[PDB]
Each structure stands twice: as C-alpha cells, then as structure tokens.
Design a protein around this ligand. Structure first.
Ligand SMILES: CC(=O)O[C@H]1C[C@@]2(C)[C@@H](C[C@@H](O)[C@H]3[C@@]4(C)CC[C@@H](O)[C@@H](C)[C@@H]4CC[C@@]32C)/C1=C(\CCC=C(C)C)C(=O)O
Ligand SMILES: Nc1nc2c(ncn2[C@@H]2O[C@H](COP(=O)(O)OP(=O)(O)O)[C@@H](O)[C@H]2O)c(=O)[nH]1
Ligand SMILES: [Mg+2]
Ligand SMILES: [Zn+2]
Lengths: 99, 666, 208
RNA sequence: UGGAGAGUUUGAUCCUGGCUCAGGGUGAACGCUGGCGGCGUGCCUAAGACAUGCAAGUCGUGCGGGCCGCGGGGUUUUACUCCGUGGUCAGCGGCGGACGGGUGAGUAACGCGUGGGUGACCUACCCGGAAGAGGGGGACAACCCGGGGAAACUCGGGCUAAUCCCCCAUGUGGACCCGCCCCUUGGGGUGUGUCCAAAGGGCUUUGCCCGCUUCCGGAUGGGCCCGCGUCCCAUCAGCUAGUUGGUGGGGUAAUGGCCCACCAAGGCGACGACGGGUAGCCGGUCUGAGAGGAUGGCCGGCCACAGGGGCACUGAGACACGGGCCCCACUCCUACGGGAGGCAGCAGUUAGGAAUCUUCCGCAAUGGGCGCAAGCCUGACGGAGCGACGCCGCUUGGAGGAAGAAGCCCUUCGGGGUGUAAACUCCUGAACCCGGGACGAAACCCCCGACGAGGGGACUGACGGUACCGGGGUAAUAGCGCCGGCCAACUCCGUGCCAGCAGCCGCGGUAAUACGGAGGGCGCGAGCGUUACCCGGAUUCACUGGGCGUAAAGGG
C-alpha cells in the first residue's frame, strides 16, 4: 500500500518552506533598497542595499540560490542603486558600492 | 498426513421437480457442514463441505423444468444424490420425472421430504407414491413428532433415538428421548427396517428370527450395501427452512451415500479403438473430464473438472485429446462455501477447478502430457423439442446475431442453430419454452440484437390434378440468328410422392437428337416457381411427343425455352393444387392423459394411426401438417402435466383443404 | 538425415554407376551392371532430349549423391566454396573431400561412405587424440585419423583394415595399416579425385 | 570476383508493350506430418482495461527515544530505574529513489545523423592542489497528555538530540558595482568599497579513518547554438502580431521575443512557404552485379511518453514510470463525511486478433544504490520452463543378400515394375541403465607487512548431481509438395463443360501425362506446402540504363 519515500516528501515540504522565505525576503528587501536609492536617501539606502546583499550570498550557501543566482541578483542590485544615486546624491556612507 | 482416504468422498447432487427445496436445502447443508465455531449463492458449480470426517461435493442445479440435460450431466460426473420431495405437494403429479431419469444413468440416491411443516405435509403420502408412481423400495428411516404445524422433534428407527427442535433458527435442538405416547409406533418400523436390511445381510436375518438385535454397525452395512445397488431408497425428513432433519440428513449422507470407490469405473477409448475402464487410482494415467466453464473476474477462465485416474497437479501441463491441445494448468482451486481455497492437486475421484487452459470447452477429456491420449465417453443425447423463427431485422442485426451464437453456442451446447435450407430465416433449437424464451432475453439484451420472433414457414409444393397437352412455340425469324424452337408435350399428374419423369417420345426425329438434352433442362428448370405461389412444382410425368425445328435458326437454347414454355403452361392449365408437408409423430403418454391427447391431435388437421402399448405408457402414431404443429411441446406437456413426450419425422406432401388454397394466395 | 532406403537405384537413374554400397557394387550386380537404366515403370524407354536445366540438376544430384549428404549441407558447402578465394570448382570438392565420414572411407576404415559414417558416429574414430563423432567434421592439413582403442579389435575394422594391405591411398593421404593411423597430407586435388562429375555444370546450376 | 531468363496479342512474322512465373528474405501466422540437442527468438493488433505477488533502498561510525533480550545496578532497600553492546520499531536527519527496466502514442522537428561553436553555461559522487574547521544561540518529530475520525490519518498543548536550522568571527580565497591594464562577444588581471565559509562521528584517541567549508584544476555526464542531410499531396499558393528587428526590464546555470513594456514595419514562399497524409531517427537489416529499392524486430546510441491534460515543490540533476497538486475518464473501500489508486517494470488475467511463453530458480557470477565494514536491496542480470519461430548438428541403421518371394501396378500376356528394397545373416549400438562428476570462484574479509607494493590464509554455485567421463546397452520416428508447358518427374482406372483445377497460357463437352484414385517417378526431408509482405527478375521511372513520324508520348 505504501513506500517510505514520503519521508522525502515531508522534507520536500520543509525545505521549500524554508528557502521559500529567504527567497521572498531578499525580494521585498531588494526593493526597499532601490526604492530609497532612487528616492534620494543616499546613505540610508546604501545601508539596506548592503543588507540585501548579505541575505543573498547568505541564501547562496544552502540550496536556495546558487552559482551566479546570487552574483546575478547582486550585479543588478548594486547596479540600479548606483544608477539612481547619480540622480544627484554622491554615495554617502561607505555602503557596499565601491568608490 | 494422508488427509485423503478416498473412501471419505461424497459427491452428491440435489435433484427434484421445481418448487421443491433443492436450492434452499443446499445453502442449509452449507451452514451445518461448516458452522465450525471452535476455539481458534451456489458460488460456482461444485462446492466442498466437511461433515464428520468426510468431504462433500455438491452440485445443486437440477430444476427439472422442461430442459433437464444439465441435471443429467452433473448426474454422470457425481456418484450420489438426494431426491428432495415436497412433503406438502401430496396429490403430487410431478414428484416424478427427476428419478426415472436417475437410474436412467445408474446412480444411487436417498429421499428427503422437505416441507414436513407446510399444510398437507403427510410423510406416508409420499411413500404411498414413491412406490405408486416410480415404484421403488424406499425405507422409512424416520418418523416425525408433530405432523405439520406441530413440528417438534424427530425419530430415527434404525437407532431408535429421538431428537427435538425447540425453534427454527437452527440452534436449540437436542436428542431428547421419545415423548410418552409415540414410542410404540416406532418398533414395527424399526423391525421392518431390520426386516428390510435382512434382504442384504443374512447375519441381520437369522439374528432377527433367533431374537438377537443386529449391531448398529452391521445394520447400517445392510441398508448401505442395499441402497448402492439401486434396490432401496432411505427416506428421511424435515423442514429445511426451519433447519430440521438436516443435520440428521447429513449423517444419512455418509452412512448410506456411495463413495467414489463404491461406484462403477468410467469407460474410455484408446487412440487405437477399444473400450477400457478408468481406475480411481491416484497413481495411474491422468484422466479427467471437464464440465463447466466460467469467467472469473479475479482469476479468469475456470474449468471445473471431475478426475477419475492419475492426479492433476498445480503448475504442470495437461493435454486435451478432444481438441488436441496442450493446456498448461497453473493453479488448482476448490470452492469452499465462502472463500477460495487454493490447493495443490486433485487426486482421482476428486472435484474442483483449474485455472489456465483456453481451448478446453465442456465435456473435454484431459490426460497427462504423455498419457495414452484417450477420450472418455460422456455421450449424452438430449436433442430439441421447440424452435422459433428468428429474423434479425435489417441485415444490420443479422450480424450481432452471428456473434450471438458464436459465444452463446459454447456457453451452452444444449441447442442448435440452423439456416432453413429453403428460405433464409434461421431456426433456434431449444429444449422447452422457457429455454428459447430466456435466450430471447440475453440474445436480445446482452447482445442488444432486436429481431423478429414468429414461427417457421412451410415447405409447400405445386402440382396438378388433370393431365394436359399444350403447344411450345418460340420462333423469331427476322433475319439471321432465326431462333426457332417448338415442342408439344404430354403432362400427367402422378401419385403424391412420384417425382420427376420425362418422355423422349419423338418418332423419326422431328426434333433433332442434339436438342433434347436442352429441351429437358428447360422443362426441368421452369418447374421451379409454381403457377400458384411459386414453389417446386413436383409429382408429375412429362411426355415430349412432338415439335419441329429449323435447319439454321434452331439452337440448343431456343429449345430449352420452348420446352420451358410448354411446361410453364400445362401446370397453369391442369388445375394446380397447393401440396403441403405431413409429419409422422409418436407421443409417448400414460393412457391416463391419452383420451384428450388424441383429441387435441384430431383438432389439428391430423388423422390418427394407432397405439401399441409400451412400458407402463402407451404410444400414439399419426400424421399432421407442420403449420398446425408448431410449439407442440408446450401443448403435449399440457395434456400430460409433464408425463408426455414425442418424436417427429417427415413422410409425404398432400393437398390443402381448398379453404386453405385461397388462404395461401399471399 | 543421411537418406536411407534403396541406393543401387540411384546407382541407376544417374545411369553412371556408384559405389554407395561399396563391396557388392563391385560384384556382378552394382545393380546397373544388370539393369543399366532409370528405375520406375517406364525407365527403359527412348529418353527425350534433356533440357538445359535437367542437365545441370543431374550433375549436381550426381556429385551430391556420391557423398550422400542433404541438399541443405551440400548447398552450404558450395555457397562457402564460392566466397572462398580460389577456383570455386576444385575448392568445392576440396571440402566435400575433407569430411570425416569421407576421409574415413578414403583411408579404408570402411567399405562404403554409408558405413564410414556410422563408424564416425559411434566414436570408433579419432582425430589427433580426442575422438570425434560428427561425420561433417572437417579435417585440416596434417591430422591423424585413427581408429579408437576400444574399437581396434572389432571384426569389421579388421576385414576392411585387411584388404588395405597392398592397396594405395590417394597421394593426399598416408596410411599405416598397423597402428590403424592415417595422415591428411594435403588437400586432395582436381584429378586425384577421378569423379564422373563435372563441377562446371553444378556451378552453373547454382547460378540460376 | 560480379550480371542466365521463360510463358502469353498473329494463320505466320518482326517490334512495342502489359500481365505472369522460377530466386532471396520474415518477430511471422495457417495446413498436413513432427524424434534429440545447442544457440537465438517469441502481443507486429487495443499507447484498451487490469485481480495477485514481487519489481528501491540503505547507513546505530549522524541524533534522541519506544519495545525486548543481557551486564552492573544506581541509594543504605524498590526509589529521581543511569550506564556500555546487540536485536528491534518507527521519528529524525544523510545519500539513493532523475541510474537501471518498459514503450513508440506523439513528433517532418536542430527530433535524429554528421561536423562544429560556446568571450553564452552546468556537473552529486571520483582524482590532484591550496587554506581552514573560532565562538555562541535555536527550534520539530519521536515521546507524554488532551481532542476529531468509520477509515486514511489529523488537530492542540508541553518536552528534547543531531552531520537540522540561525547569528558573530577569521577569511587562504571566491562573489558583486567603479576605475585602470592585457585580451577581444561576458577571457585573464588589478586597487577602493561591500558581501559569504563550515559538522561532527569511530578508534587502538596530540595519529589515523569517514566526513565537513571555501577556492583553483582534472575526469565523466549534460544544457543551449549553428552548416549540411532528413517522406507523399500543388486538385494545399500564398503564410505571419509576439509576427521580423530594436531599446530597456524580467527570467535562467546560460544565449535568446523565452516572457513584458514601448518604439520601427518587417519576417517567410515555386530553391515549394502555409496546409493536409504518413512516420519515432540512426548504427544497421533484407534484396541487388552494382547504382538503387525497400526497411528500422532482437542488440547498441539519441529522442519522447508513462491512464488523457495542466503545474510547480524538493534537489547537482526531474517538471520525476513504482513523488506531490488540480481537472477529466475509469477501479476500489465507505460508518457515503470523505479516502486509496495507475502493470508502455517481471509473471499473469481479460478484451482484441491469424498470432506471440512460467503468477519459475538464484543474487553463484557481472553490474548498480546505501555502509569504514560485516552486510542489506537489486523480476538489472545469470539461469531454468513452454513454442520446429529461426538457424546449426545428430538419429530412425551399416555390410552382405535372388537373372529377382509375396502383394500391388502395367502387359503385345512372352513379360515388365516396385527392387537389394523386404526376408534372412552376421555388427555397431540413439534411447536407457549402475558409477564418477565440473569450469564458471577469486576476490571483498583476515594475518604478516606500513590498512602501499608484494606474500600468505579462509568463506563463497541458481543452472546442477546438469554438461561431460568410464562401464553396461535394445535395430530403434517419416513425412510433405509435385509429375501439360514455364519445370526436373507418366502410365492405368474413374469421370463426361459434371465434379472439379487454376500463378499465367489454359485443362474438363467418352480413350484427360492438366479433374479424382492407384502404381510409378521427381524434389526436399523433421520437415514440406499455402497465405501475407519486401527486393529481384522489371534498362517496366532508365544516374549507371529508356523514349515521343505511324506503337503511349512535341505544347497551335
Ligand atoms: C443456477 C442454477 O443452478 O440453475 C440456474 C442457471 C441455469 C441452469 C438457469 C436455467 C437456464 O437459464 C440455464 C441455461 C442452460 C440457460 C441457457 C444459457 O443461458 C445457459 C448458459 C444457461 C446455463 C445455466 C442456466 C442459466 C437456472 C435456473 C433458472 C430458472 C428459471 C426460472 C424461470 C424458474 C434454475 O436453476 O431454476
Ligand atoms: N415453508 C417452507 N418452504 C420451503 C421449505 N423448503 C423449501 N421451501 C420453499 O420452496 C420454494 C423454492 O425453493 P427452491 O429450493 O429454490 O426450489 P427448487 O430450486 O425448485 O428446489 C421457496 O418458496 C422456499 O421457501 C420448507 O422446508 N418450508
Ligand atoms: Mg433452485
Ligand atoms: Zn551399386
């Protein structure tokens, strides 16, 4: 009637549920950042962006994101942010983005 | 660990005329033989049950109802039988049949009076018949306490013990001694029993006259050694519905019912050609007969079989000589009254079902896969009695019907299909009304075919009364293939059953030698479509006494026409007469019913011919028209309540009563 | 299997005498010696001219009947000799000749091929040691065909091994009546085999 | 090293030309016969449905317990019942269930084949190299108690372990944006800034073994892209809006209208678009002198699909055949409130059909997953079974033996034939008997060594008491087709355009080598015929290798 491979499903669910979060996290967070950065919040933007970044390479560790999955998202985050901070702002605090 | 002494085998059949108690009696046997309860549907043909160190195989199905055939089939396979009787039905005219068809094969049986509780339930009354009707030597084996509504306990003479029944749920029984009165009644019947048993054991004979009582063990031996010979028939009793006399009838089983050994060996034939017994030794060649196929949803095709010699084995290989085929028996199976017992083998004399086999239909003989490729007997000959016209509506259904029998004729070879060799329409051979009737449901339902069901047609014939002579001319002279043929003939009627006779009555040769062949093929021909309705104008002599010709125009053919004209008209002219088919029939009937039997036949356009007695019966011969002869079964069986049977043959053709002349102009 | 049934009949038909029996065929009665004509009811009648086909068929039946060997096998061998590099005609004979049941007869251990076969079958023979029983076995160049030991003293073997003292054995074979041995020097040759058979025809027969 | 033609239009001829036959081949069926063995092979149809059993697991050397059998009992006695090891039951977590096995429905297409491109990528396990393994917290089952339920299970409290999760640290080093350097599609560097590592088990315990973390390289397997090749129908001629291109996003391991927004009107087609029919593709297979024609079963490679259809989750990998979700169809249980399923896995059932097998034995070998191992799983596989389905080998006898029995057939009645055939005579001795009896199996493990080389030792056979070997050993299965010509093989009797034959031409209408029987003969032989289908013959679609005045064919 049954085969103890559901042990694989039970897990299947757990894991999903886990990364499912750091997943949607980086999302909302990725936004909160570019938002300000564009809004003008020069430094306090770079702050969040620096956080977002972490949470990314952080998720890269497990099986959530991986390879360039992280690196890609980054090259776009600290890409658009910097391309909104030039909307007259001069990268204030020493956020991620390099001089 | 033998578990099979053979001498412990009881293969029995419950026969008896409808109403009775056959079926109900069986489910009951299948409750006692297996209520067990120890500190731990006739679901397929034959079933096994255990009763006091004895395996019993039952095949309840008889029914009698017109078509027996089946009853008489299980009968051949099995060894014993209970002829249940309806105690109530006293002025019982059909108690009969059943049995007179049992010794018909050669098998032993005991009697049971079932409804000993239903009004009119008079035990004696049966025996007052079981020797008055069939006339055997039954032996009172019990005497009921409380005739009918007052059905309490019962008494077994042979063992002078009394039992009782406090209910009808089959629980509160017990062996309580004789109740005050009664007693006396016993003795005498227990003496006659022993007096009867005397005609078997001399030991139980002297001891009788000396004043000693036969041992309860040597006494049984007599009765048993007496039944098995078809000399006596132990009668018992009890309301099978109220569970009474059953557990006692079950003893009655083993105690008097033959074992696969007490019975006479089956004959079979070698591939060379010579009879030979088949010995019940579970170590000789493997010889088994088949008798019932059934489609199981779980295991598929099932082929219930009765082994005689050798022993079939689970996961082996068999061989059916009948249809020269190598079947591979994979699994053996025994039907228990409630589950599927999967056993590993059936030793000679045992019965069950095999799984596998594809070409094995009814009556098949299966031997080892090297054994003498022999074929048993089985030859049963139950032909038909009632048929019908079946015209499959538009040619569409004419097919659904072909398949109809293409599977229905394997699932029941107790019939015959035939295409009337004279008029498309097909006949459906049956063995009694009901028979064809219920086919008409399945063949029309589970086959969705929707055709017609009226009656056959009659192979009429044309001919004449007065002799005539007319001209046969043809000539067509316009310019070339002249076409010139002409002849004169002498047409003259011949006795009803004369045939076809022509006469080469040409003098010098006014009609060339080479053209006569053709002038005949022309006359012979034309006679096809009658002058009245279009039927084989027969029973006449033709005389070609004249006709001329032309040197160039004549033709082999031109003459075939001219002669086909001379005839095409002599019959029209000599006053035609619509002849019809007359049959020879022989109704076997007790001169009891005879009186009306003959009547009815007279009022059937028929004229009687005689009645030279036979057995206790009497035979009647006579002629009749096939038209006024349809569905005769259910008319003969009417004027005889069942005790009537007939045959039928063709004879001659004869004029229709004129009133039936213009009738047929259809 | 190896035919069986009237033979000094085929001896006939082909009308070119054969030694299917061996000894007797030599006596005044190889059959054809007395009735040199096709069997059957007609047989002795003016024979219509043969068709271009009949001819080749008969030359095949001739050659194949000599070695008495199922058309099947006969054909396989031919179909081999063809694809074989060398004048197919000779070649074919080459193999036919290399059959153990034959080498035996040739070496004289048996009076007839029909007999030589039975011996081979019943292990009365041996090749370089291990005994063989397949008549069809094909001998290579430089083999020793000997009579087994259990055999050695069996009437038949003697008598036949007897008539051998004196007679010579094909240039492609060397026999030692004593040790009942015999080597397969070389592959027989076209002429060595004086057969009343033309290979050319037979070939042409397998070309249609 | 390879090429054969014939019959049939006429009174006769020559040409054209169609038809037809002899040859080979088959997952075959059907008919009549059928003795042995070896190696192959066996649902071609309903990709219809399917009872039953088994086809995927495994680690206690990752972790905490429940239950059971042992130690010593914790305390002074049972008490808060701990400990170490060996069974167990599930729960955790780790890998493996994406390989293996089945199938051809779909698909005319970068699906396949072949040859290449990845400055456009991925790769668990396995090798080699470099550097690490520093602190802390934290939940959820199991378990207990309580509640819903027919069932499948499920909900609520409360504990608790771990190689499970999470934060801080160090970052050999890797990831990102910016700038410069080499390079040249996103390839290597390099400086500022920023971001990220980790896990612990076993022993013989400062040393190993198995793991962990990051990074570079190898190896293996893959994704995507491109040139060329890849069937029939023009009585399918025009097709196209995410359509073709662009900019910017999203998405991905990665390119890309793969998706979206918004611009621009373009993209494709007689070199055959679009539409319709059919079909899984190849190595190969059959035939053929070759070119070519057919074809794609078994074995190997790729693809695709797992009742029909859609979809994501987990994960190195899947949109997963014995995983999940939803729709529909069908099967089953139901306390009818809701549950359980998917044999195109092995075997088998039913239906269909002309037709295609045992619910077999073994993990002994090979191979695969899990483990340090012992070992466990393994219908993959290694074998057995049934089937002349194919092919190969073998037997039913060998040597004698009559101017020649019998019977039967023909006859000119002299006789001819069957025919050395039988008989009979010797001789060998399939089958069958006692007896002996394998190869496949030498490693993993263990001991010396140094758990390396090398040396030594032990346990391992389903088939199988089979093959085979020695001894003993009886004359011991033949059919089927054909006999007018092509085409080898002819007489008699029946029959009378009847019955029947028949591939073609034709045979049969009182003497039939053509029907039916007999004798005899020819062919082949455990086979022999028939029916399907493909090549050949057919230079009869002609590239090799054809034609058009009148034969079919020149367009007004
Ligand atoms: C179950 C048993 O034992 O008999 C049953 C089963 C039964 C013998 C049936 C009578 C008759 O159909 C029988 C035939 C031959 C009817 C024709 C086919 O369909 C056969 C395949 C079928 C086999 C058994 C069957 C179906 C029975 C009856 C029927 C009684 C009918 C009436 C109207 C009284 C019986 O026994 O009375
Ligand atoms: N009252 C009563 N009825 C009975 C008894 N035995 C049988 N019957 C009835 O007989 C009728 C037919 O029974 P069945 O055995 O099927 O008849 P069969 O098949 O012809 O033997 C039913 O009404 C049964 O109830 C009995 O002992 N008592
Ligand atoms: Mg009944
Ligand atoms: Zn001769």
């Amino acid at each position: 009637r049954n085969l103890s491979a559901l042990k694989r499903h039970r897990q299947s669910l757990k894991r999903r549920l886990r990364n499912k979060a750091k997943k949607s996290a980086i999302k909302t967070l990725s936004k909160k950042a570019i938002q300000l950065a564009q809004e003008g919040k020069a430094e306090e933007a770079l702050k969040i962006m620096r956080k977002a970044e972490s949470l990314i390479d952080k998720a890269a560790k497990g099986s959530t994101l991986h390879k360039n999955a992280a690196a890609r998202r980054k090259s776009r985050l600290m890409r658009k942010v910097r391309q909104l901070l030039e909307a007259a702002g001069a990268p204030l605090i020493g956020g991620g983005l390099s001089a | 660990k033998v578990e099979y002494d053979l001498k412990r085998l009881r293969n029995i059949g419950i026969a008896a005329h409808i109403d009775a108690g056959k079926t109900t009696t069986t489910e009951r046997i299948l409750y006692y033989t297996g209520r067990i309860h120890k500190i731990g549907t006739i679901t397929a043909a034959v079933t096994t049950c255990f009763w006091k160190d004895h395996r019993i195989n039952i095949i309840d199905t008889p029914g009698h109802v017109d078509f027996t055939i089946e009853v008489e089939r299980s009968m051949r396979v099995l060894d014993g039988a209970i002829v249940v009787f309806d105690s109530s039905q006293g002025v019982e005219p059909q108690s009969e049949t059943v049995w007179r068809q049992a010794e018909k094969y050669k098998v032993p049986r005991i009697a049971f009076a079932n409804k000993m509780d239903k009004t009119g339930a008079d035990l004696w009354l049966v025996i007052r018949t079981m020797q008055e009707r069939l006339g055997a030597r039954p032996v009172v084996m019990q005497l009921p306490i409380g005739r009918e509504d007052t059905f309490s306990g019962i008494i077994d003479v042979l063992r002078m013990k009394a039992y009782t029944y406090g209910n009808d749920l089959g629980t509160d029984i017990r062996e309580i001694p004789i109740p005050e009165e009664y007693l006396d009644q016993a003795r005498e019947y227990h003496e006659k029993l022993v007096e009867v048993a005397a005609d078997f054991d001399e030991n139980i004979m002297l001891k009788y006259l000396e004043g000693e009582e036969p041992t309860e063990e040597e006494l049984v031996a007599a009765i048993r050694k007496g039944t098995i010979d078809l000399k006596i028939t132990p009668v018992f009793l009890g309301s099978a519905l109220k569970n009474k006399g059953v557990q006692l009838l079950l003893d009655a089983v083993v105690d008097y019912l033959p074992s696969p050994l007490d019975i006479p060996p089956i004959k079979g034939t070698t591939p060379e050609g010579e009879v030979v017994e088949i010995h019940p030794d579970p170590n000789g060649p493997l010889a088994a007969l088949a008798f019932k196929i059934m489609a199981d949803p779980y295991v598929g095709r099932l082929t219930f079989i009765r082994v005689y010699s050798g022993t079939l084995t689970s996961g082996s290989y068999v061989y059916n000589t009948t249809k020269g085929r190598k079947e591979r028996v994979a699994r053996l199976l025994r039907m228990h009254a409630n589950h599927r017992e999967e056993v590993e083998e059936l030793k000679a004399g045992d019965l069950g079902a095999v799984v596998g086999l594809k070409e094995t239909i009814t009556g098949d003989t299966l031997v080892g896969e090297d054994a003498p490729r022999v074929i048993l007997e089985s030859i049963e000959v139950p032909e038909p009695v009632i048929d019908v016209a079946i015209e499959p509506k538009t040619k569409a259904d004419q097919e659904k019907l072909s398949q109809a029998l293409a599977r229905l004729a394997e699932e029941d070879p107790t019939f015959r299909v035939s295409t009337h060799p004279e008029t498309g329409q097909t006949i459906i051979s049956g063995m009694g009304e009901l028979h064809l009737e219920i086919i008409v449901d399945r063949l029309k339902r589970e086959f969705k075919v929707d055709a017609n069901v009226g009656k056959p047609q009659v192979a009429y014939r044309e001919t004449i009364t007065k002799p005539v002579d007319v001209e046969g001319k043809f000539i067509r002279q316009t310019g070339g293939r002249g076409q010139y043929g002409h002849v004169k003939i002498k047409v003259e009627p011949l006795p009803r059953g004369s045939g076809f006779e022509f006469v080469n009555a040409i003098v010098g040769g006014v009609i060339p030698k080479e053209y006569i062949p053709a002038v005949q093929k022309g006359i012979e021909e034309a006679m096809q479509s009658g002058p009245l309705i279009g039927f084989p104008v027969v029973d006449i002599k033709v005389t070609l006494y004249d006709g001329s010709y032309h040197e160039v125009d004549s033709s082999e053919m031109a003459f075939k026409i001219a002669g086909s004209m001379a005839i095409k008209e002599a019959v029209q002219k000599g006053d035609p007469v619509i002849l019809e088919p007359i049959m020879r029939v022989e109704v076997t009937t007790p001169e009891e019913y005879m009186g009306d039997v003959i009547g009815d036949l007279n009022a059937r356009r028929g004229q009687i011919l005689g009645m030279e007695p036979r057995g206790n019966a009497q035979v009647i011969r006579a002629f009749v028209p096939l038209a006024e002869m349809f569905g005769y079964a259910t008319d003969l069986r009417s004027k005889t309540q069942g005790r009537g049977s007939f045959v039928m043959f063709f004879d001659h053709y004869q004029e229709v009563p004129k009133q039936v002349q213009e009738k047929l102009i259809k | 299997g190896r035919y069986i049934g009237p033979v000094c009949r085929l001896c006939r038909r082909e009308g070119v005498k054969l030694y299917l029996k061996g000894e007797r065929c030599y006596s005044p009665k190889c059959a054809m010696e007395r009735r040199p004509y096709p069997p059957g009811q007609h047989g002795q009648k003016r024979a219509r001219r043969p068709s271009d086909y009949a001819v080749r068929l008969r030359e095949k039946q001739k050659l194949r009947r000599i070695y008495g060997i199922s058309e099947r096998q006969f054909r396989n061998l031919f179909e081999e000799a063809s694809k074989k590099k060398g004048v197919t005609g000779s070649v074919f004979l080459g193999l036919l000749e290399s059959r153990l049941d034959n080498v035996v007869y040739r070496l004289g251990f048996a009076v007839s091929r029909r007999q030589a076969r039975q011996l081979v079958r019943h292990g009365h023979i041996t090749v370089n040691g291990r005994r063989v029983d397949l008549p069809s076995y094909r001998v290579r160049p430089g083999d020793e065909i000997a009579v087994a030991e259990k055999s050695r003293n069996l009437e038949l073997i003697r008598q036949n091994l007897e008539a051998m003292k004196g007679r010579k054995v094909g240039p492609w074979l060397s026999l030692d009546v004593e040790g009942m041995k015999g080597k397969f020097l070389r592959l027989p040759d076209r002429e060595d085999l004086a057969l009343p058979v033309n290979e050319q025809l037979v070939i042409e027969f397998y070309s249609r």
